[PDB]
Amino acid sequence: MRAELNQGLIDFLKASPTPFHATASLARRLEAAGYRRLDERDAWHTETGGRYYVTRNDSSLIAIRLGRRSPLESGFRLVGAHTDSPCLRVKPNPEIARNGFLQLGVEVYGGALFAPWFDRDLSLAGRVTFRANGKLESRLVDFRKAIAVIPNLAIHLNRAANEGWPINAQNELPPIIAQLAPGEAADFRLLLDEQLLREHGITADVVLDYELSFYDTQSAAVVGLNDEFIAGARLDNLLSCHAGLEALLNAEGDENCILVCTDHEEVGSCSHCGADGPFLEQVLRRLLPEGDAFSRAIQRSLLVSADNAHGVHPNYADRHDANHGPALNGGPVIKINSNQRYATNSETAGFFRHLCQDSEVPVQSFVTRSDMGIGPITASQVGVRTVDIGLPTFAMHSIRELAGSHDLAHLVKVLGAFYASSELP
Amino acid sequence: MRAELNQGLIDFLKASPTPFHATASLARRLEAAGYRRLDERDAWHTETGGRYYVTRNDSSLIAIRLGRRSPLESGFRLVGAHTDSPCLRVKPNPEIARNGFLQLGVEVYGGALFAPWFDRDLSLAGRVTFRANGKLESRLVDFRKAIAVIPNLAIHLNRAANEGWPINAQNELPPIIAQLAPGEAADFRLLLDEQLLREHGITADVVLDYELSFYDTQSAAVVGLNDEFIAGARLDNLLSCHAGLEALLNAEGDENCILVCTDHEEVGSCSHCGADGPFLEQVLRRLLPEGDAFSRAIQRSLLVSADNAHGVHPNYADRHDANHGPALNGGPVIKINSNQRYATNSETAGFFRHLCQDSEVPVQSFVTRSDMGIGPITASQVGVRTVDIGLPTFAMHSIRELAGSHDLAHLVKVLGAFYASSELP
Amino acid sequence: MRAELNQGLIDFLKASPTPFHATASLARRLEAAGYRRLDERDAWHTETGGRYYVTRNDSSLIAIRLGRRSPLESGFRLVGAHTDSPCLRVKPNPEIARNGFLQLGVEVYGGALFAPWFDRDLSLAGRVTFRANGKLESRLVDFRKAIAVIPNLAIHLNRAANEGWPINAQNELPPIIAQLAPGEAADFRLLLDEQLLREHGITADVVLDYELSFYDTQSAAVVGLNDEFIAGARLDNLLSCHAGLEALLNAEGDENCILVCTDHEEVGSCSHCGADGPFLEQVLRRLLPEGDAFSRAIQRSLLVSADNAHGVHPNYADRHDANHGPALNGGPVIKINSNQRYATNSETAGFFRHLCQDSEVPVQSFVTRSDMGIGPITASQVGVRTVDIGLPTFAMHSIRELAGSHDLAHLVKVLGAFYASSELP
Ligand SMILES: [Zn+2]
Ligand SMILES: [Zn+2]
Ligand SMILES: [Zn+2]
Ligand SMILES: [Zn+2]
Ligand SMILES: [Zn+2]
Ligand SMILES: [Zn+2]
């Protein structure tokens, strides 16, 4: 059922307010399915038929199904996605006290659209690092309830509001979380300490640092007269993580299947744990002999880089090429850009397109208007052929994005077919 | 003879309208010379004196001559160039039907100069991926004849034409290829199917995707009162591919010689097969033992990165530094930029400059005016010392560029000397 | 069929790089067909059925075919065209010596589109006036070989090239023709002396002055998927000179036919040499008695003023009126402009429109958009009724223009019908 898949997506989104939580949610499903967690510090002893996963920074995840045939001779079938989404992150000395409020200073992470973050019931989640019994450790928190808001200024006090103004992030985006009594101090670290106790039963000696993201408490939901759509934060790109996961868990065949979901894509993938890092490469090498084996394996592999595409928006149709306007619910989009903003080529495109035909999934094509500006990055790190595809969406980088409610099922089906395909060379 | 070299260049350019064709043309000369093609999927068994080449994506080529002394102890002598040039590529849903014409929608690939593409007799070539007997495959096509034109608008309907306007690529660059009868449909994929039959005797079940570049049907030619010049598309950087090839095929000595010609340079080299990919590195490692051997070899190696330079243009001389204006026919230019836009340093510069002196080839120096903005990329991928050099040219990224007709011979001679040089450390 | 007419057009364009050469090429054809050259200094003795031509400045030509009925009683059937085209012409003290090159200073003749002149393999042709054996004389030269180039500046040194800039003709248009040795003197007049020896076996005492045009060495060619098009320099207006000639030479009937091809149309006419000089009037008067004859004859005459029109361009279709967008290969266009930018009227239009219908040639209508800005000149000299017609083309005043490959035949057919037409309005 599309309906079961879509509900599964809504659940996953709800459990995944930050890249740490997305990674943990992926890990829980994998383990329930029998996948064994490996640690990058240990020597591994994997084998044919094994089901494994590994993480790095608790925010990037690689899932591995080793097939019957070795990667050396049959290659890997890889699906790539990303765990991060543009949002607001709490600063390290964040307490702002003004006009009787307590606010938290925020950085903008990734290319967020600012306006939609206003007038939303926000909570806060992510990683907290602390010392307990002279031991340094980390946990995830999620306050869950709506503790914050970034309100708009009344139109009465900003009469040209609808003219547009340059929203200044330093000044306009700090959320209000509380009011302070006369002479009441404010200690955010103390609030985190309370949350650690409440959520984990832990008392910290001291809260040191954290990576906390504001997020919307409004769950994702089906929308539309005929339930055509799905609305929710983080569709870019938890939509693809979830699809890629369902495809891996249900895939037939006995190929070598990889699900790589990396952090830091919204920011250029350049970290210890991003796609422009050697995470993927160092995991794959561990599944092969030394020498030429990795190079040979990779030239028999294909990466399907799954990241949301732009549907043609009816109130802004002129932002698309008239020949390449994807329809929501018209299936996955093959993304082409010969300037290598996407890595797709005629062979990767052709293979995917054929795969969609054999699976009876509709498929679409996108290029940008020629007067407008992980695929290329991972191709360039490990050298693997890549097709960039995505489900068509609107309002990418909003706090609440829109996709087609038929498209997840289309994508799970074709990814399932990819992962089961014994042929690529 | 300069004359034979220049004719060889004109032939090579004609056979090489796309990076796929350039790669194929290089491969045909190599094979005629006894070089054996290796496939990156196979285990290799190479040996001293062997002559090999390999390709990736059918658009990047590495040619290898293994010397008598091992690369571990004598290093590699590498010449780098690139197979791609700025141009117009057909979009994936390209048919535009308007005012009785059929046009093809185009992306701009690389930093093309738009104006010169107008009012030229264009053909179309590149890779087509298709299914024939339930098998997926690729071929090259080249329509050869002049089937397309991007006409200017009459000056009468654009009286300030000579004032300059911003040429909009989405709207102004689609070429006209035909006129359509009343109610005649247009299927580009069908035209490709016919071309596959005509050119290869193949009937496709279905044409899926393609990477097709428009190109100029006017051959390259000697020009000038005393035949001082050569004019042609793709001098950047088929000029260097060709030179590098002739130098490899004729080189004396018994050093380890590499010719690396990569795709996607005009776009940042960031692909499976570009210089910012691991193609080169993974090939070189296959020629050495495991362990420290590759690192040691590379620190005994030198990359001569050959890509066209800017001659000082007499109608725009103030775009050069007055002290660093290279003359066409004044020999190769050593390109310096301490901000690492070029990787040359005093040692790589000095070695090259000396090499030119011992070969009796004139040599020049270029830096940019200090108020203006593969070498650095490959140095940074494999860690190899690099000198960036180029033959001086005009009108780079036009459809028709200009070089000096004495300079190819100068460059072949010095590259020959580099490839035969037994000393670098 | 008339692949014949098109090949003849290509040959004529190739032999006619300047107005002087176009006039010579017209004359050689007319003589081959039996037409006798008269000289304007002599008294003429012409007669019924006579075939004559005359020139002025060696750059304007009038061909005369006298019918059986006198002009007085049956009028003249005139077709008008022009021998000149916008181009670049050598200055009288042209040598520019800079950064080791020799360039030639140029004037812009007519309303040339500058950009397309760049990055083209140019030769040089025209009239040289010199002294030999103490006497003054003129010959035409054509170097033929591609001796010159006006290169673009690299996009790397002009990074907003595609945004447009105002091309300065004084600075950016001088062609490079050579490189000079240190201390080597440049003498253009000496180069002309050598060309005179080489091409005519003449040695000059002194080369005095010249009128030389740069031109493109790439021949005109058929282009397009189904050979729909013809591309070439000088379609405006050698396309009409050629059509008129063919019609005159093949026309049936008995009428007095005139072909008038004048120089200097692209600059307003207004030389000794036409069309609002008195060349045409002074030749026509000499075919009639004194008195009221000329005036009477001219009121029974019609001038078909043939000069290229603008087809509707699909990448710039808003530059036409939506009701008046001529199609290439749609036949001759009747040009209408109430402000007398064209002299067409309801009677001259209707007659031409009827002629097309009876010849089974398709015919089109053009007016400009009412918000945007030769026939009128010659009607206003002489007083003759005039229909302004033209074949539809693109990119007019480029170095390489485009016409329909069917339209020349269409035009020759109707001009032949015009010339054989015994009555007019
Ligand atoms: Zn994304
Ligand atoms: Zn994103
Ligand atoms: Zn280059
Ligand atoms: Zn380039
Ligand atoms: Zn004209
Ligand atoms: Zn004109």
UniProtKB/Swiss-Prot annotation, chains A, B, C:
Coiled coil: none annotated. One of its GO terms (cellular component) is cytoplasm. The keyword Zinc applies. Disulfide bonds: none annotated. Zn(2+) binds at residues 82, 156, 397. Its EC number is 3.4.11.-. Keywords: Aminopeptidase, Hydrolase, Metal-binding, Metalloprotease, Protease, Zinc. NCBIfam families: PRK02813.1. Belongs to the peptidase M18 family. PANTHER family: ASPARTYL AMINOPEPTIDASE (PTHR28570:SF3). This is Probable M18 family aminopeptidase 2. It comes from Pseudomonas aeruginosa (strain ATCC 15692 / DSM 22644 / CIP 104116 / JCM 14847 / LMG 12228 / 1C / PRS 101 / PAO1).
